[PDB]
Amino acid sequence: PLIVPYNLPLPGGVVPRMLITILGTVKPNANRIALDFQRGNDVAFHFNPRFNENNRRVIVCNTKLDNNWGREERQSVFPFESGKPFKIQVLVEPDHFKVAVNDAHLLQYNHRVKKLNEISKLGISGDIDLTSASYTMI
Numbered sequence: 001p002l003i004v005p006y007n008l009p010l011p012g013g014v015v016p017r018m019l020i021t022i023l024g025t026v027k028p029n030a031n032r033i034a035l036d037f038q039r040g041n042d043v044a045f046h047f048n049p050r051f052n053e054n055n056r057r058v059i060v061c062n063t064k065l066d067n068n069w070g071r072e073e074r075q076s077v078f079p080f081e082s083g084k085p086f087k088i089q090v091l092v093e094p095d096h097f098k099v100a101v102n103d104a105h106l107l108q109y110n111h112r113v114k115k116l117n118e119i120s121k122l123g124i125s126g127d128i129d130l131t132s133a134s135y136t137m138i
């Protein structure tokens with residue numbers, strides 16, 4: 001177990017068939033969780049579960065370029081629960097990130113940042129106890 005925020009290095013960036021696994025537990029009072037796949041200061045892919053946005057639970061995905069947030073992609077399917085252990089898996093595919101939570105497909109996010117081999121850090125932050133963060137090639 002690790003204390004958030006945590007940066008996982010992705011040396012040489014990401015590549016299709018790379019599977020990133022984040023294990024941890026949602027804190028009881030949780031408000032938010034964030035994963036940030038970074039290319040330098042740009043955020044190629046921000047994955048942001050919000051537990052109470054206007055009293056609704058939503059997943060917000062976006063990209064940050066030149067320090068400006070782009071167009072949000074939102075999903076109301078919400079597989080996280082306060083207090084519960086989770087597994088987020090991010091599968092890098094040629095044209096998108098694919099996310100599954102607790103072994104159920106959640107969403108796909110098309111690559112806006114094209115230079116996958118420069119997406120060299122994953123930030124993990126928010127209302128979680130982080131158990132582990134690793135990757136493998138499938």
Ligand SMILES: CO[C@@H]1[C@@H](n2cc(-c3ccc(Cl)c(F)c3F)nn2)[C@@H](O)[C@@H](CO)O[C@@H]1Cc1cn([C@@H]2COC[C@@H]2F)nn1
Nearest residue numbers: 032033034046048060061062063069070071072125126127
């Ligand atoms: C309030 O800040 C968030 C951003 N955010 C979250 C965290 C954050 C930090 C720490 C933790 Cl621990 C954690 F979980 C976290 F989510 N930091 N920045 C990010 O979620 C962003 C995504 O679009 O929305 C907001 C910022 C935003 C969005 N938009 C417009 C709205 O429509 C189009 C464009 F997007 N302008 N600004």
